[PDB]
Structures are given as structure tokens and as C-alpha cells.
Amino acid sequence: FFGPQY
Amino acid sequence: FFGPQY
Amino acid sequence: FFGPQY
Amino acid sequence: FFGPQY
Amino acid sequence: FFGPQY
Amino acid sequence: FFGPQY
Amino acid sequence: FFGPQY
Amino acid sequence: FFGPQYQ
Amino acid sequence: FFGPQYQ
Amino acid sequence: FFGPQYQ
Amino acid sequence: FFGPQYQ
Amino acid sequence: FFGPQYQ
Amino acid sequence: FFGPQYQ
Amino acid sequence: FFGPQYQ
Amino acid sequence: FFGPQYQ
Amino acid sequence: FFGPQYQ
Amino acid sequence: FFGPQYQ
Amino acid sequence: FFGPQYQ
Amino acid sequence: FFGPQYQ
Amino acid sequence: FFGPQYQ
Amino acid sequence: FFGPQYQ
Amino acid sequence: FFGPQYQ
Amino acid sequence: FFGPQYQ
Amino acid sequence: FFGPQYQ
Amino acid sequence: FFGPQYQ
Amino acid sequence: FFGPQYQ
Amino acid sequence: FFGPQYQ
Amino acid sequence: FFGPQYQ
Amino acid sequence: FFGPQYQ
Amino acid sequence: FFGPQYQ
Amino acid sequence: FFGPQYQ
Amino acid sequence: FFGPQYQ
Amino acid sequence: FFGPQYQ
Amino acid sequence: FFGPQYQ
Amino acid sequence: FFGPQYQ
Amino acid sequence: FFGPQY
Amino acid sequence: FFGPQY
Amino acid sequence: FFGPQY
Amino acid sequence: FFGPQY
Amino acid sequence: FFGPQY
Amino acid sequence: FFGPQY
Amino acid sequence: FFGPQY
Amino acid sequence: FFGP
Amino acid sequence: FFGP
Amino acid sequence: FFGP
Amino acid sequence: FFGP
Amino acid sequence: FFGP
Amino acid sequence: FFGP
Amino acid sequence: FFGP
Amino acid sequence: FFGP
Amino acid sequence: FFGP
Amino acid sequence: FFGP
Amino acid sequence: FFGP
Amino acid sequence: FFGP
Amino acid sequence: FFGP
Amino acid sequence: FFGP
Amino acid sequence: FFGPQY
Amino acid sequence: FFGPQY
Amino acid sequence: FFGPQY
Amino acid sequence: FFGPQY
Amino acid sequence: FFGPQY
Amino acid sequence: FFGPQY
Amino acid sequence: FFGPQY
Amino acid sequence: FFGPQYQ
Amino acid sequence: FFGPQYQ
Amino acid sequence: FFGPQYQ
Amino acid sequence: FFGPQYQ
Amino acid sequence: FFGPQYQ
Amino acid sequence: FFGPQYQ
Amino acid sequence: FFGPQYQ
Amino acid sequence: FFGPQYQ
Amino acid sequence: FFGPQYQ
Amino acid sequence: FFGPQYQ
Amino acid sequence: FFGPQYQ
Amino acid sequence: FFGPQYQ
Amino acid sequence: FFGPQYQ
Amino acid sequence: FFGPQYQ
Amino acid sequence: FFGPQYQ
Amino acid sequence: FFGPQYQ
Amino acid sequence: FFGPQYQ
Amino acid sequence: FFGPQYQ
Amino acid sequence: FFGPQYQ
Amino acid sequence: FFGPQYQ
Amino acid sequence: FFGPQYQ
Amino acid sequence: FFGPQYQ
Amino acid sequence: FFGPQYQ
Amino acid sequence: FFGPQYQ
Amino acid sequence: FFGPQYQ
Amino acid sequence: FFGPQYQ
Amino acid sequence: FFGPQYQ
Amino acid sequence: FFGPQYQ
Amino acid sequence: FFGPQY
Amino acid sequence: FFGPQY
Amino acid sequence: FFGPQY
Amino acid sequence: FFGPQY
Amino acid sequence: FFGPQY
Amino acid sequence: FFGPQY
Amino acid sequence: FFGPQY
Numbered sequence: 001f002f003g004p005q006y
Numbered sequence: 007f008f009g010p011q012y
Numbered sequence: 013f014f015g016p017q018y
Numbered sequence: 019f020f021g022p023q024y
Numbered sequence: 025f026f027g028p029q030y
Numbered sequence: 031f032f033g034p035q036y
Numbered sequence: 037f038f039g040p041q042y
Numbered sequence: 043f044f045g046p047q048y049q
Numbered sequence: 050f051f052g053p054q055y056q
Numbered sequence: 057f058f059g060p061q062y063q
Numbered sequence: 064f065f066g067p068q069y070q
Numbered sequence: 071f072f073g074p075q076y077q
Numbered sequence: 078f079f080g081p082q083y084q
Numbered sequence: 085f086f087g088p089q090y091q
Numbered sequence: 092f093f094g095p096q097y098q
Numbered sequence: 099f100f101g102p103q104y105q
Numbered sequence: 106f107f108g109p110q111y112q
Numbered sequence: 113f114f115g116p117q118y119q
Numbered sequence: 120f121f122g123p124q125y126q
Numbered sequence: 127f128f129g130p131q132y133q
Numbered sequence: 134f135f136g137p138q139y140q
Numbered sequence: 141f142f143g144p145q146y147q
Numbered sequence: 148f149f150g151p152q153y154q
Numbered sequence: 155f156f157g158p159q160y161q
Numbered sequence: 162f163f164g165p166q167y168q
Numbered sequence: 169f170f171g172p173q174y175q
Numbered sequence: 176f177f178g179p180q181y182q
Numbered sequence: 183f184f185g186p187q188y189q
Numbered sequence: 190f191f192g193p194q195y196q
Numbered sequence: 197f198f199g200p201q202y203q
Numbered sequence: 204f205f206g207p208q209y210q
Numbered sequence: 211f212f213g214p215q216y217q
Numbered sequence: 218f219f220g221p222q223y224q
Numbered sequence: 225f226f227g228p229q230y231q
Numbered sequence: 232f233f234g235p236q237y238q
Numbered sequence: 239f240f241g242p243q244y
Numbered sequence: 245f246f247g248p249q250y
Numbered sequence: 251f252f253g254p255q256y
Numbered sequence: 257f258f259g260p261q262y
Numbered sequence: 263f264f265g266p267q268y
Numbered sequence: 269f270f271g272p273q274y
Numbered sequence: 275f276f277g278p279q280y
Numbered sequence: 281f282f283g284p
Numbered sequence: 285f286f287g288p
Numbered sequence: 289f290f291g292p
Numbered sequence: 293f294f295g296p
Numbered sequence: 297f298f299g300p
Numbered sequence: 301f302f303g304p
Numbered sequence: 305f306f307g308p
Numbered sequence: 309f310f311g312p
Numbered sequence: 313f314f315g316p
Numbered sequence: 317f318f319g320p
Numbered sequence: 321f322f323g324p
Numbered sequence: 325f326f327g328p
Numbered sequence: 329f330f331g332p
Numbered sequence: 333f334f335g336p
Numbered sequence: 337f338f339g340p341q342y
Numbered sequence: 343f344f345g346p347q348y
Numbered sequence: 349f350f351g352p353q354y
Numbered sequence: 355f356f357g358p359q360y
Numbered sequence: 361f362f363g364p365q366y
Numbered sequence: 367f368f369g370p371q372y
Numbered sequence: 373f374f375g376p377q378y
Numbered sequence: 379f380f381g382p383q384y385q
Numbered sequence: 386f387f388g389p390q391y392q
Numbered sequence: 393f394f395g396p397q398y399q
Numbered sequence: 400f401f402g403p404q405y406q
Numbered sequence: 407f408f409g410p411q412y413q
Numbered sequence: 414f415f416g417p418q419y420q
Numbered sequence: 421f422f423g424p425q426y427q
Numbered sequence: 428f429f430g431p432q433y434q
Numbered sequence: 435f436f437g438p439q440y441q
Numbered sequence: 442f443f444g445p446q447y448q
Numbered sequence: 449f450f451g452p453q454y455q
Numbered sequence: 456f457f458g459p460q461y462q
Numbered sequence: 463f464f465g466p467q468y469q
Numbered sequence: 470f471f472g473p474q475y476q
Numbered sequence: 477f478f479g480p481q482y483q
Numbered sequence: 484f485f486g487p488q489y490q
Numbered sequence: 491f492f493g494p495q496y497q
Numbered sequence: 498f499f500g501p502q503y504q
Numbered sequence: 505f506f507g508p509q510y511q
Numbered sequence: 512f513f514g515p516q517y518q
Numbered sequence: 519f520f521g522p523q524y525q
Numbered sequence: 526f527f528g529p530q531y532q
Numbered sequence: 533f534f535g536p537q538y539q
Numbered sequence: 540f541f542g543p544q545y546q
Numbered sequence: 547f548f549g550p551q552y553q
Numbered sequence: 554f555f556g557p558q559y560q
Numbered sequence: 561f562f563g564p565q566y567q
Numbered sequence: 568f569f570g571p572q573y574q
Numbered sequence: 575f576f577g578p579q580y
Numbered sequence: 581f582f583g584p585q586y
Numbered sequence: 587f588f589g590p591q592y
Numbered sequence: 593f594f595g596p597q598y
Numbered sequence: 599f600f601g602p603q604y
Numbered sequence: 605f606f607g608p609q610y
Numbered sequence: 611f612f613g614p615q616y
């Protein structure tokens with residue numbers, strides 16, 4: 001699972 | 007799963 | 013799954 | 019699945 | 025699991 | 031598990 | 037488990 | 043080969 | 050090969 | 057091979 | 064091979 | 071092989 | 078082989 | 085083989 | 092697949 | 099797959 | 106897969 | 113997989 | 120997997 | 127896995 | 134696994 | 141690709 | 148890729 | 155990749 | 162990769 | 169990798 | 176890796 | 183690794 | 190690829 | 197790849 | 204890869 | 211890889 | 218890898 | 225690897 | 232590995 | 239025939 | 245035929 | 251034929 | 257044919 | 263043919 | 269053919 | 275053929 | 281062909 | 285071919 | 289071919 | 293081929 | 297081939 | 301081959 | 305091969 | 309796309 | 313994509 | 317993608 | 321991806 | 325990824 | 329990843 | 333990773 | 337869609 | 343979609 | 349999707 | 355998806 | 361996904 | 367995922 | 373995941 | 379390249 | 386390259 | 393390269 | 400390289 | 407390299 | 414290298 | 421290297 | 428080149 | 435080259 | 442090269 | 449090279 | 456080289 | 463080399 | 470070398 | 477450069 | 484450079 | 491450089 | 498350089 | 505350099 | 512340098 | 519240097 | 526690349 | 533690369 | 540790479 | 547690499 | 554690497 | 561490495 | 568390393 | 575030099 | 581130099 | 587030097 | 593030097 | 599030196 | 605020196 | 611010196 005979690 | 011989660 | 017989720 | 023989800 | 029967790 | 035936890 | 041824990 | 047561009 | 054670009 | 061780019 | 068880039 | 075880059 | 082880089 | 089780098 | 096970026 | 103960045 | 110960064 | 117950084 | 124850093 | 131640092 | 138440091 | 145960058 | 152960078 | 159960097 | 166760095 | 173560093 | 180460092 | 187250091 | 194540089 | 201540098 | 208340096 | 215240095 | 222140094 | 229040093 | 236030193 | 243002729 | 249001729 | 255001719 | 261000719 | 267010719 | 273010729 | 279020729 |  |  |  |  |  |  |  |  |  |  |  |  |  |  | 341259907 | 347269907 | 353279906 | 359299905 | 365299914 | 371399933 | 377399942 | 383063989 | 390064999 | 397064999 | 404054998 | 411054998 | 418044997 | 425034997 | 432030979 | 439031989 | 446031989 | 453031999 | 460021999 | 467022999 | 474022999 | 481022979 | 488022979 | 495022989 | 502023989 | 509023989 | 516013989 | 523014999 | 530054919 | 537054919 | 544064929 | 551074939 | 558074949 | 565084959 | 572084969 | 579010398 | 585010399 | 591010398 | 597010497 | 603000497 | 609000497 | 615001397 002990639003992708004930032006603001 | 008790619009793509010930011012604002 | 014690509015593509016941002018505003 | 020591509021394409022932004024405003 | 026990659027991707028920063030602000 | 032990688033990715034910083036601010 | 038890697039990744040800093042500020 | 044996969045490489046789409048965003049914004 | 051996978052490599053998408055964001056912002 | 058996996059290598060996406062962020063910001 | 065895995066190597067993503069952040070900020 | 072694993073080697074991601076941060077900041 | 079494991080070797081990630083921080084800051 | 086394990087060898088991560090900090091700061 | 093060629094996709095390089097110049098600024 | 100070629101994707102290098104220049105600034 | 107080639108992806109180097111120049112500043 | 114090639115990914116070196118120059119400053 | 121090649122990833123060296125130059126400053 | 128190659129990752130040396132130069133300053 | 135190669136990782137030496139030069140200053 | 142024949143592509144150098146000059147400043 | 149033929150690509151050097153000059154300053 | 156033919157890619158040196160000069161300053 | 163043919164890549165030296167000069168200053 | 170052909171990569172020396174000079175100052 | 177062919178990599179010496181000179182000063 | 184071919185890597186000596188000189189001063 | 191041919192590209193020499195003079196002066 | 198051919199690229200010599202003069203002066 | 205061919206790249207000599209003069210003067 | 212060929213790269214001699216003169217003077 | 219070939220790289221001699223003169224003077 | 226070949227790399228002699230003169231003078 | 233070959234590397235003699237003169238003078 | 240690349241080189242200059244000063 | 246790369247080199248200059250000073 | 252790389253070298254210069256001073 | 258790498259070397260110079262002083 | 264690497265060396266110089268002083 | 270590495271060496272110089274003084 | 276490494277050595278110099280003084 | 282360089283041949284004078 | 286260098287041959288004068 | 290260097291051959292004068 | 294160096295051969296004068 | 298060095299052979300004069 | 302060094303052979304003059 | 306050194307052989308003059 | 310097989311999709312009945 | 314097999315998806316009935 | 318096998319996904320019925 | 322096996323995921324029914 | 326086996327994940328029903 | 330076995331994870332039902 | 334075995335983790336049901 | 338390669339295979340036969342006996 | 344390679345295989346046969348006996 | 350390689351295998352047969354007896 | 356290699357194996358057969360007897 | 362190698363194995364058979366008797 | 368190597369093994370058989372009798 | 374090597375072993376059989378009798 | 380695709381080329382299966384039957385019976 | 387794809388080429389399975391049956392019966 | 394893919395090539396399984398049956399029966 | 401992939402190549403299993405059955406029966 | 408992958409190659410198991412059955413029955 | 415992977416190669417188990419059954420029955 | 422991996423290679424177990426059964427029955 | 429797509430080229431098998433059969434008898 | 436896709437090239438097997440059969441008899 | 443994809444090339445097995447069968448009899 | 450993908451090349452087994454069967455009889 | 457992927458190359459076993461069977462009889 | 464992946465190469466066993468069977469009879 | 471992965472190479473056992475069976476009878 | 478492709479040049480194979482069939483008899 | 485490809486040049487195989489079949490008989 | 492590929493050159494194998496089949497009989 | 499690949500050159501194997503089959504009979 | 506690969507050169508094995510099969511009979 | 513690989514050169515094994517099978518009979 | 520690998521060279522084993524099978525009969 | 527050189528490969529002429531005789532008779 | 534050199535490979536001429538005779539008779 | 541050198542490999543000519545005779546008769 | 548040297549490997550010519552005779553008769 | 555040297556390995557010619559006779560008869 | 562030296563290994564020629566006779567008859 | 569020396570290992571030639573006779574008859 | 576290529577080419578037969580009958 | 582190519583070409584037979586009968 | 588290639589080419590047979592009958 | 594390659595090429596047979598009948 | 600390669601090549602048979604009948 | 606390689607090559608048979610009949 | 612390699613090569614048989616019949």
C-alpha cells in the first residue's frame with residue numbers, strides 16, 4: 001500500500 | 007493501491 | 013487503483 | 019481504474 | 025506498508 | 031512496516 | 037518495524 | 043508498462 | 050514495470 | 057519493478 | 064525490486 | 071530487494 | 078536485502 | 085542482510 | 092517506454 | 099523503462 | 106528500470 | 113534497478 | 120540494486 | 127545490493 | 134551487501 | 141533518446 | 148539514453 | 155545510461 | 162551506468 | 169557502475 | 176563498482 | 183568494490 | 190550517439 | 197556512446 | 204562508453 | 211567503460 | 218573498467 | 225579493474 | 232584488481 | 239571529422 | 245577524428 | 251583518435 | 257588512441 | 263594506448 | 269599500454 | 275605494461 | 281577515408 | 285583509415 | 289587502421 | 293592496428 | 297597490435 | 301602483442 | 305606477449 | 309475482457 | 313480481466 | 317485479475 | 321490478484 | 325495476493 | 329500475502 | 333506473511 | 337483466446 | 343487464456 | 349491462465 | 355496460474 | 361500458483 | 367504456492 | 373509454502 | 379512472441 | 386516469450 | 393520466459 | 400525463467 | 407529460476 | 414533457485 | 421538454493 | 428525474429 | 435529470437 | 442533466446 | 449538462454 | 456542458463 | 463546454471 | 470550451479 | 477545483425 | 484549479433 | 491553474441 | 498557469449 | 505562465457 | 512566460465 | 519570455473 | 526558488425 | 533563483433 | 540567478440 | 547571473448 | 554576467455 | 561580462463 | 568584457471 | 575583480411 | 581579487404 | 587587474418 | 593591468425 | 599594461433 | 605598455440 | 611602449448 005495519508 | 011488520500 | 017481521492 | 023474522483 | 029502518516 | 035509516523 | 041516515531 | 047501523470 | 054507521477 | 061514518485 | 068520516493 | 075527513500 | 082534511508 | 089540508515 | 096522531466 | 103528527473 | 110535524480 | 117542521487 | 124549518494 | 131555514501 | 138562511508 | 145541539459 | 152547535465 | 159554531472 | 166561527479 | 173568523485 | 180574518492 | 187581514498 | 194564539447 | 201571534453 | 208577529460 | 215584523466 | 222590518472 | 229596513479 | 236603507485 | 243584548426 | 249590541432 | 255597535438 | 261603529444 | 267609522449 | 273615516455 | 279621509461 |  |  |  |  |  |  |  |  |  |  |  |  |  |  | 341473446446 | 347476444456 | 353480443466 | 359484441475 | 365487440485 | 371491438495 | 377495437505 | 383502447440 | 390506444450 | 397509442459 | 404513439469 | 411516436478 | 418520434487 | 425524431497 | 432523449425 | 439526445434 | 446529441443 | 453533438452 | 460536434461 | 467539430470 | 474542427479 | 481542458417 | 488545453425 | 495548448434 | 502551444442 | 509555439451 | 516558435460 | 523561430468 | 530558469406 | 537562464414 | 544565458422 | 551568453430 | 558572447438 | 565575442446 | 572578436455 | 579586464396 | 585583471389 | 591589458404 | 597592451412 | 603595444419 | 609598438427 | 615600431435 002503506497003500513497004500518503006494526509 | 008496508489009494515489010493520495012487527502 | 014490509481015487516481016487521487018479528494 | 020484511472021481518473022480522479024472529486 | 026509504505027507511505028507517511030501525517 | 032516502513033514510513034514515518036509524525 | 038522501521039520508521040521513526042516522532 | 044504503466045505510467046500515468048497527475049496534475 | 051510500474052511508475053506513476055504525482056503532483 | 058516498482059517505483060512511483062510523490063510530490 | 065521495490066523503491067518509491069517521498070518528497 | 072527493498073530500499074525506499076524518505077525526505 | 079533490506080536498506081531504507083531516512084532524512 | 086539488514087542495514088538501514090538514520091539521519 | 093520513455094518519460095523524463097525537465098525543469 | 100526510463101524516467102529521470104532534472105532540476 | 107532507470108530513475109536517477111539531479112539537482 | 114538503478115536509482116542514485118546527486119546534489 | 121544500485122543506490123549511492125553524492126553530496 | 128550497493129549503497130555507499132560520499133560527502 | 135556493500136555500504137561504506139567516506140568523509 | 142538524445143537528451144542533455146545545459147545552463 | 149544520452150544524458151549529461153552541465154552548469 | 156551515459157550520465158555524468160559537472161559544475 | 163557511466164556516471165562520475167566533478168566539482 | 170563507473171562512478172568516482174573528485175574535488 | 177568503480178569508485179575512488181580524491182581531494 | 184574498487185575504492186581507495188586519497189588526500 | 191556522438192557529442193563532444195569544446196572550450 | 198562517445199563524449200570527450202576539452203579545456 | 205567512451206569519455207576522456209583534458210586539461 | 212573507458213575514462214582517463216589528464217593534467 | 219579502465220581509468221588511469223596523470224599528473 | 226584497472227587504475228594506476230602517476231606523479 | 233590492479234593499482235600501482237609511482238613517485 | 240570533428241576537431242578545430244587553430 | 246576527435247582531437248584539436250594547436 | 252582522441253589526443254591533442256600541441 | 258588516447259595520449260597527448262607535447 | 264594510454265601514455266603521454268613528452 | 270600504460271606508461272609515460274620522458 | 276605499467277612502468278615508466280626515464 | 282583520409283588519404284592524400 | 286588513416287593512410288597517406 | 290593507422291598505416292602510413 | 294598500429295603498423296607503419 | 298603494435299608492429300612496425 | 302608487442303612485436304616489432 | 306613481448307617478443308621482438 | 310471476459311465479462312458475460 | 314476475468315469477471316463474470 | 318480473477319474476480320467473479 | 322485472486323479475490324472472489 | 326490471495327485474499328477472498 | 330496469504331490473508332483471507 | 334501468513335495472517336488470516 | 338487460445339484454447340480448444342472439445 | 344491458454345488452457346483446453348475437456 | 350495456463351492449466352487444463354478435466 | 356499454473357496447476358490443473360482434476 | 362503451482363500446485364494441482366485432486 | 368507449491369504444495370498439492372489431496 | 374512447500375508442504376502437502378493430506 | 380506468442381506460440382503454443384496442441385496435440 | 387510465451388510457449389506452453391500440450392499432450 | 394514462460395514454458396510449462398503437460399502430460 | 401518459469402518451467403514446471405506435470406505427469 | 408523456477409522448476410518443480412510432479413508425479 | 415527453486416526446485417522441489419513430489420511423489 | 422531450495423530443494424526438498426517428498427515421499 | 429520469429430523463427431522455429433519443424434519436421 | 436523465438437526459435438525452438440522439433441522432430 | 443527461447444530455444445529448447447525436442448525429440 | 450531458455451534451453452532444456454528432452455527425449 | 457535454464458537447462459536440464461531428461462530421458 | 464539451472465541444470466539437473468534425470469533418468 | 471543447481472545440479473543434482475537422480476536415477 | 478541477424479543471420480541464421482536453415483537446412 | 485545472432486547466428487545459429489540448424490540441420 | 492549468440493551462436494548455438496543443433497543437429 | 499553463448500555457444501552450446503546439441504546432438 | 506557459456507558452452508555446455510549435450511548428447 | 513561454464514562448461515559441463517552430459518551423456 | 520565450473521566443469522562437472524555426468525554419465 | 527562484420528559477417529560476409531563465402532560459397 | 534566478428535563472424536564470417538566459410539563454405 | 541570473435542567467432543568465425545569453418546566448413 | 548574467443549571461440550571459433552572447426553569442421 | 555578462451556574456448557575454441559575442434560572436430 | 562582457458563578451456564578448449566578436442567574431438 | 569586451466570582446464571582443457573581431451574577425447 | 576577476408577577472402578579465400580585459391 | 582573482401583573478395584576472392586583466384 | 588581470416589580466410590583459408592588452399 | 594585463424595583459417596586452415598591445407 | 600588457431601587453425602589446423604594439415 | 606592451439607590447433608592440431610596432423 | 612595445447613593441441614595434439616599425431
